[PDB]
Amino acid sequence: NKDMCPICKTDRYLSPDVKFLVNPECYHRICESCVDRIFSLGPAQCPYKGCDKILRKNKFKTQIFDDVEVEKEVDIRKRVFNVFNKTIDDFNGDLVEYNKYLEEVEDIIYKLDHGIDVAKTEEKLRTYEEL
Amino acid sequence: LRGEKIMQNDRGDVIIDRYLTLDQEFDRKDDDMLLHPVKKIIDLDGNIQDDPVVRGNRPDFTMQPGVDINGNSDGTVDILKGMNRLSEKMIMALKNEY
Amino acid sequence: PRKLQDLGLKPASVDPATIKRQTNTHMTGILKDYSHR
Amino acid sequence: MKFYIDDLPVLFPYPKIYPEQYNYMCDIKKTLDVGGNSILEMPSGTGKTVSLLSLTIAYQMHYPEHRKIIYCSRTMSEIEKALVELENLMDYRTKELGYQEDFRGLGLTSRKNLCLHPEVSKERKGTVVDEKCRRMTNGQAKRKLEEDPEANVELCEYHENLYNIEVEDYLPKGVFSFEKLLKYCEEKTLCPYFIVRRMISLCNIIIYSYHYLLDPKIAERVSNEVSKDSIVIFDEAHNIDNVCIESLSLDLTTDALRRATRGANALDERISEVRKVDSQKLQDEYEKLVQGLHSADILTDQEEPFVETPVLPQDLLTEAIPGNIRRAEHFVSFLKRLIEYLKTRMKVLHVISETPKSFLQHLKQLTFIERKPLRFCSERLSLLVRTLEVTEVEDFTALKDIATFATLISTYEEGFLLIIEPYEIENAAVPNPIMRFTCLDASIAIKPVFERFSSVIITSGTISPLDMYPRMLNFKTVLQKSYAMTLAKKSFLPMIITKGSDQVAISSRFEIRNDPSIVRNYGSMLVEFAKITPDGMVVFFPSYLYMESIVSMWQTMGILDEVWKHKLILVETPDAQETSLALETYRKACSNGRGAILLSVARGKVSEGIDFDHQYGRTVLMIGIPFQYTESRILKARLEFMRENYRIRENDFLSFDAMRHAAQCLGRVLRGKDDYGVMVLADRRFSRKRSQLPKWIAQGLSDADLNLSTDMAISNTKQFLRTMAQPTDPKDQEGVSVWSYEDLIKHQNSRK
Ligand code: SF4
Ligand SMILES: [Zn+2]
Numbered sequence A: 001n002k003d004m005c006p007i008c009k010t011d012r013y014l015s016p017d018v019k020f021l022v023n024p025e026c027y028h029r030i031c032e033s034c035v036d037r038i039f040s041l042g043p044a045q046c047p048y049k050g051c052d053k054i055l056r057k058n059k060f061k062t063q064i065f066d067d068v069e070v071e072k073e074v075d076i077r078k079r080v081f082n083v084f085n086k087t088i089d090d091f092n093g094d095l096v097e098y099n100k101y102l103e104e105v106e107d108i109i110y111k112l113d114h115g116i117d118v119a120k121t122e123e124k125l126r127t128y129e130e131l
Numbered sequence B: 001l002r003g004e005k006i007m008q009n010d011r012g013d014v015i016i017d018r019y020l021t022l023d024q025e026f027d028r029k030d031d032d033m034l035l036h037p038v039k040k041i042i043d044l045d046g047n048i049q050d051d052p053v054v055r056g057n058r059p060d061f062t063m064q065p066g067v068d069i070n071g072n073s074d075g076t077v078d079i080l081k082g083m084n085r086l087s088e089k090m091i092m093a094l095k096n097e098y
Numbered sequence C: 001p002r003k004l005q006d007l008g009l010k011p012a013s014v015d016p017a018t019i020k021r022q023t024n025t026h027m028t029g030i031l032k033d034y035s036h037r
Numbered sequence D: 001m002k003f004y005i006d007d008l009p010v011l012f013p014y015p016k017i018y019p020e021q022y023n024y025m026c027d028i029k030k031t032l033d034v035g036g037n038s039i040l041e042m043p044s045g046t047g048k049t050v051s052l053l054s055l056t057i058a059y060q061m062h063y064p065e066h067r068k069i070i071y072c073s074r075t076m077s078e079i080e081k082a083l084v085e086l087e088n089l090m091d092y093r094t095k096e097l098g099y100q101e102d103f104r105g106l107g108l109t110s111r112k113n114l115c116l117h118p119e120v121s122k123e124r125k126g127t128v129v130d131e132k133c134r135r136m137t138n139g140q141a142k143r144k145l146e147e148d149p150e151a152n153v154e155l156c157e158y159h160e161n162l163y164n165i166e167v168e169d170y171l172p173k174g175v176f177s178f179e180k181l182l183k184y185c186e187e188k189t190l191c192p193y194f195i196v197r198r199m200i201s202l203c204n205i206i207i208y209s210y211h212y213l214l215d216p217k218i219a220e221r222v223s224n225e226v227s228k229d230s231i232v233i234f235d236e237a238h239n240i241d242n243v244c245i246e247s248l249s250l251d252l253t254t255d256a257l258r259r260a261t262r263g264a265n266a267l268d269e270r271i272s273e274v275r276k277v278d279s280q281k282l283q284d285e286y287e288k289l290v291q292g293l294h295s296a297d298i299l300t301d302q303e304e305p306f307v308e309t310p311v312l313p314q315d316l317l318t319e320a321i322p323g324n325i326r327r328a329e330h331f332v333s334f335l336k337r338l339i340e341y342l343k344t345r346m347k348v349l350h351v352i353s354e355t356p357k358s359f360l361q362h363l364k365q366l367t368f369i370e371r372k373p374l375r376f377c378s379e380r381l382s383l384l385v386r387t388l389e390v391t392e393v394e395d396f397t398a399l400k401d402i403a404t405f406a407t408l409i410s411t412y413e414e415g416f417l418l419i420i421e422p423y424e425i426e427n428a429a430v431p432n433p434i435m436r437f438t439c440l441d442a443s444i445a446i447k448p449v450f451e452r453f454s455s456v457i458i459t460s461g462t463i464s465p466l467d468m469y470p471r472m473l474n475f476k477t478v479l480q481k482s483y484a485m486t487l488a489k490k491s492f493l494p495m496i497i498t499k500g501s502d503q504v505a506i507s508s509r510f511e512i513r514n515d516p517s518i519v520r521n522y523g524s525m526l527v528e529f530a531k532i533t534p535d536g537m538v539v540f541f542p543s544y545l546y547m548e549s550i551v552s553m554w555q556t557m558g559i560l561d562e563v564w565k566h567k568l569i570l571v572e573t574p575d576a577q578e579t580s581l582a583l584e585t586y587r588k589a590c591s592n593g594r595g596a597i598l599l600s601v602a603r604g605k606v607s608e609g610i611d612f613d614h615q616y617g618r619t620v621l622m623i624g625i626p627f628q629y630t631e632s633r634i635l636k637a638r639l640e641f642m643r644e645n646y647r648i649r650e651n652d653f654l655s656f657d658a659m660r661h662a663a664q665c666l667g668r669v670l671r672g673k674d675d676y677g678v679m680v681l682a683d684r685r686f687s688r689k690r691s692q693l694p695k696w697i698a699q700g701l702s703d704a705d706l707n708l709s710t711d712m713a714i715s716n717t718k719q720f721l722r723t724m725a726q727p728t729d730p731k732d733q734e735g736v737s738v739w740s741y742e743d744l745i746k747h748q749n750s751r752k
């Protein structure tokens, strides 16, 4: 797992040109070679033991942080900050309101990361983004 | 014992070399034989321990003992301690029971 | 060796094209040859 | 003696006085009465500390203001010397005034230097000592013991015994040196460290190192108790900039970050464990955080924050927590992703230097951490750890470094730079990435000191040139002058050697350190001088690495065998305890006539407070100019900042920095005027640095000695040593170099 593809086990030592990729849907490492073959002609199920989440090739990206757990939080933070975005001037300098607003956003992000209330919170995200 | 760097390229006597590890035990025993509390006037340990939380920029390699490519000590520091130990033992020998 | 170098793997050999194969005679019998020092 | 100044009577602890000392005292009195800062450069061969204490102590006892005195030295050993001199001066006053006046004087240092606990004083690291003492003194053990005596937690009898007596009765009136302080406290089972820190507000004169005044981590607690109008003295402040810069500097390695993730994971696990069983503590802490309280309002005076404030007290935000890191879990996640960003920035392949603003902008881009929450990282962590019942903090020790970095980078933006290097050691098989946060401006750390205190005296034996220090440190002086010793007969012979006996130029340039001719030429100089030097010889090298290489070369050649026949060889080592034993052996060897030679580093531990008065030093051999490593990213950045801001040329500062260290070592040989020694500067580059040396040293350097050979140097040294062994004529120094009471009055009459 150190430097070999979980599927084809193409180690970098024998294939230094190998390049790894990850998918936000399940955050699973996979080399470029496997991605093209399984998803070139259309969507397919993740080829992992225990994972049945479908994914598309276009969604693959390069991992930034070496820790998968931190990657999930940052991407969720980016998704939330695309809807829940405000500044101190938004509350006319009211620090107390701004601090409470920041904590609420942090609370939402925490719930999304650990799936406390996925159904209820997801609806709240959809409700707010419209207005 | 002459304070000269030992070279792995050349080997001397098989019989005598057996005592090399024993000397490492004597040096540690001799280090305690010389270690004792020092007057605060020339106490260099307290100068560096004056601020236990001091954290700045660590010194360059010129201010630290030399190291090899592999990162281990080159061994030149050991002879420096050996001559330092020899001088300390000579002075201590003067202050005998007599 | 060239094929491995082109694919990335370091070859543990080289092409064999690179190797470069690289008056007075009464004193006769008395004077020793002190040619060098 | 007891003479008079314009209106201030001063009691000198000796029947005699040098002309320089009286002139030194008069100038100091003028500065104190007029106010402001001043820079005084007094020779090392004349009593400086005694003069300072004599005048300042009289000043505080005579004027109605009774201003307190703050004495700042550079090392703990200097504090001991100052206290010993103070005790002698106070004893003389007590014998002439007929009574012991109300006076308290104490020195300060870390717990390691004053811990009497039989189990905690046996530690080789000061951080561990602090942790153990805090565990037994935070009060958690006392509170737990009160609730349930069956608790196995122990207490410190020394700390406990102090509660019985009042703070004003910890020590009897007088001056207590460290040697005396430990003995008195041992006989009564009391903690010297806590006694001193609780009496700072009551001491007439307080002595501590520069780290206790310039480093924000430890200065704030001590500074909060001292007075605002007290007298401040900076003794031996010729290297104060290094202390100022190192206070706001940090270095991060790959191992530090790898150890940080483990601590962060442990912290999250600990929070989960506490959440299950005891969740009221988190809510109670959260409630206060919502109110707007900080560590000062929450933490008791008995306990100390886990993370020392790494920024100056004037730069800390007074607003409530932003709210992002208000909850424990949110803060841990905030901390965790911060560590990842640091880790992913350590994979760089070439040196990158960027300002904190650029680093913050990139941080705000890759992740969504804002500047304001970053500034509170250290403050928030100290609160979370305190409420977590973290009695064992071995895992969380690494997190202190990350918090310090976060609070430093997010606070200051000017005069600071961030350096990332792919090779900590250029000669390494595997790259070792390092992230250095360096402070370029040297006046940031000292700015509060020059503003809080009105009058500050900066004195040192080799502080020259005096014009640059005001340029480097943003402050102004009412007067700045240097005294020249009025010695009747030449007592020190400063010489410069540019070539060896073979007339070959000699230099200590690092690139040519492995040269058979230079190594032999330096070795020949060492042997030849050792033959004529009677008892003691101190050898200073430009860097420790240079000493290692050159010393090893001498061993192979066989120079040392010849040196061993005349004197014992002692060498400075990186270990502090081993070096201290070497000094003890070196001093013992010089006293008994065996003769010894000490090899040290000009920028080492020996040169920063160790003295070689009379026998322990009779000749100083400066092997090369102690030039800093020019090819250093930290140094190069520092030079650029000074050039652009203070208009200081790169070459001028580098030469000034090297000379300030060479002179520093030169002044550690003369005590009084009956002391003598020969100073030789062995480098072709010293020939043009005569104008940069201290005035009292330059005046003694003749024009014929600017460039000498080894053979010529020995002849002059032998002649000088022979000349200094003759009985000095008393009449030649009755009133030209030493003043009796009658002579001093005469000088006060002619001047008036
Ligand atoms: S209270 Fe004093 S004696 Fe006790 S552990 Fe702390 S420093 Fe040591
Ligand atoms: Zn693959």
Ligand SMILES: [Zn+2]
Residues within 6 Å of the ligand: A026, A027, A028, A046, A047, A048, A051, A052, A053
């Ligand atoms: Zn999957």
